[PDB]
Design a protein around this ligand. Sequence first.
Ligand code: NDP
Ligand code: NDP
Lengths: 333, 333
Amino acid sequence: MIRWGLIGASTIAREWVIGAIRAAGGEVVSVMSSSAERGEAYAAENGIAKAVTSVDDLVGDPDVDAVYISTTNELHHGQALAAIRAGKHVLCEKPLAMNLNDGCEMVLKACEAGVVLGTNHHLRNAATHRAMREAIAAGRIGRPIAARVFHAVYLPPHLQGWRLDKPEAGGGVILDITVHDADTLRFVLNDDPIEAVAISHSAGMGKEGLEDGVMGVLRFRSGVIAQFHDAFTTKFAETGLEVHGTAGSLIGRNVMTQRPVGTVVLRNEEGESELPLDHRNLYETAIAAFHSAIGGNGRPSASGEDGVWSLATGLAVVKAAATGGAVEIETGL
Amino acid sequence: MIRWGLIGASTIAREWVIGAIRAAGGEVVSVMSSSAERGEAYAAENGIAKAVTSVDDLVGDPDVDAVYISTTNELHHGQALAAIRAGKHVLCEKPLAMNLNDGCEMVLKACEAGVVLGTNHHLRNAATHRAMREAIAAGRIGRPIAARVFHAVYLPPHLQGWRLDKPEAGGGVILDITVHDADTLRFVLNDDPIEAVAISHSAGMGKEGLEDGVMGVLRFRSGVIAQFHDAFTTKFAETGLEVHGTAGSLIGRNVMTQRPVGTVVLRNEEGESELPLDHRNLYETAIAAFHSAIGGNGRPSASGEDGVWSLATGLAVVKAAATGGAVEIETGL
Ligand SMILES: NC(=O)C1=CN([C@@H]2O[C@H](COP(=O)(O)OP(=O)(O)OC[C@H]3O[C@@H](n4cnc5c(N)ncnc54)[C@H](OP(=O)(O)O)[C@@H]3O)[C@@H](O)[C@H]2O)C=CC1
Ligand SMILES: NC(=O)C1=CN([C@@H]2O[C@H](COP(=O)(O)OP(=O)(O)OC[C@H]3O[C@@H](n4cnc5c(N)ncnc54)[C@H](OP(=O)(O)O)[C@@H]3O)[C@@H](O)[C@H]2O)C=CC1
């Protein structure tokens, strides 16, 4: 079996990724946590044989083949570099890095190391998004003209779960949600964004206010214009992703969550019908693709390059919102 | 009865406004058309006693009390000024004018003339939009956070209806659709937009291409961020208007057309339910309000000032799309 080591004893690894690794035929052999106590307790609760408290004891363990990183965002880049230096494959939760030169550097070093580097954008693995991508390529909507993304949800400010715990350094809806919208759009449209405009909302007067909502528009290389709406403050808005074309529209409802749910309708001259979907665990699909890539068959679902694309788009959106100006998206890949 | 004269022997006056005037207790006594033949034929077909071919014979007719203007956009400002000089009330199809100083001048001259000046933004008359406005003011969604407008429809390029007829000087989705979205948002939110960002699409390479789609964002004075999507090129997208708040969301579907149709759902902690609506002809409602205003009771549905607001927002959106920069919306009222 491919044996994984975890960097970050996280909620997402517990809820989704550990089970996904095992479902896809791998095994999770070790977990690294900055805290000895947290790592041991987490190892016992999730059936993992070993807990460590150094990154090097994780990535350097001869019996770890691959590393999954789900620590706080600012730790990703350096922990991925350590794994790559140890010659281990890396699946990294977004973001890869906090800036583009660091993200580009990762992709190059992984390539130079001969290891698989993946960004865990989960949504592009859903059968909903895959159906839309495939229907578009099959001409079922003629030429795509416009896209819409709805990702305005409710995330209580500060959690965790014991109360309103650790400092938790932000840092906003754009870098936490919009980047997933960007990657999913790139997947569905099979095309790249070239510029962004945006307006964002921060709580309380311009400050250390959490950026808690954003709306904007991406211009894609094809000419498609794609709007997005991401927030932490709206309880009663369902998520969605739509693509409107010259001969049809695809309407995805409830398709931007972590769970394998949601519908896609195709509307065209015949009327409306639901596309048939075989829903499957997004994370199971991501791990399977990663395992095939390690095997020298195929690529991760989202590559290091996709992660650089999502980071560049996010950074563009932050700048367009802050400056009021349209910003060109350039990856430096 | 209040007796109306028509300036423009138009599709909209035939389909909607003539019948609305009569339903609301007025009468249409004359029609002005630049063509004698068209005006006579139109008068006979629509049961109007008189056709003329000069604006002054229309506005100066002692038996016309009020004037409805639905000519080509560039004629509005000057024809409204003639009516106002003749001391007649004016209901003007959007736009009032092509620039802000001309729109502001109209409002002032109408006020100085002692006549009612209305802009015929039809949508704010619908029971759907009215229900949303009222539910918001009643606290049914807590504090509004975000709005979304969907107005991407199919309008064949060039019509008319005999084939692909007269030159028809454009001039785009922003000034033809976005301005109605703006006015409706102002009505529903009871608040003003203060800045815009946008990206627009023109057919064929940057040129004399028709601007045939736009997406953008308005920042409102309250802090609400409101996105819109308007187009001429999408056949299979339903229209809609939504408002998402801290304690609920209002979802309007099929509510941006001329017809008295559409639904509004309120989603909140109880679930989702349809708001009960008494649908009524939008134009009948607009005329009734105008007739009351002439009577010295109440105001037109949308005033001259609302028309200046819609024009300023439209002009901001054109500039933000052209320049890539956020533009502040200032009415000069
Ligand atoms: N709500 C969210 O957190 C969201 C997260 N993401 C993405 O998912 C990834 C992980 O997120 P998620 O699984 O939700 O995060 P968790 O809060 O479950 O874990 C993240 C990190 O916080 C630390 N931590 C966990 N529990 C405690 C505790 N009781 N006291 C102190 N520190 C603790 C852990 O440190 P250690 O590993 O050292 O034990 C862990 O690496 C991130 O990389 C992020 O990009 C995306 C959107 C929302
Ligand atoms: N599709 C549209 O036209 C849209 C219109 N609007 C708004 O509605 C208003 C009127 O629109 P609508 O009723 O659709 O326009 P119509 O095309 O029906 O009429 C507009 C003008 O075009 C002229 N016209 C009409 N028929 C002919 C013909 N056979 N040959 C030459 N000229 C002709 C008329 O001139 P005359 O009056 O001199 O007879 C008339 O004033 C406008 O002010 C605009 O702002 C808004 C969105 C879309």
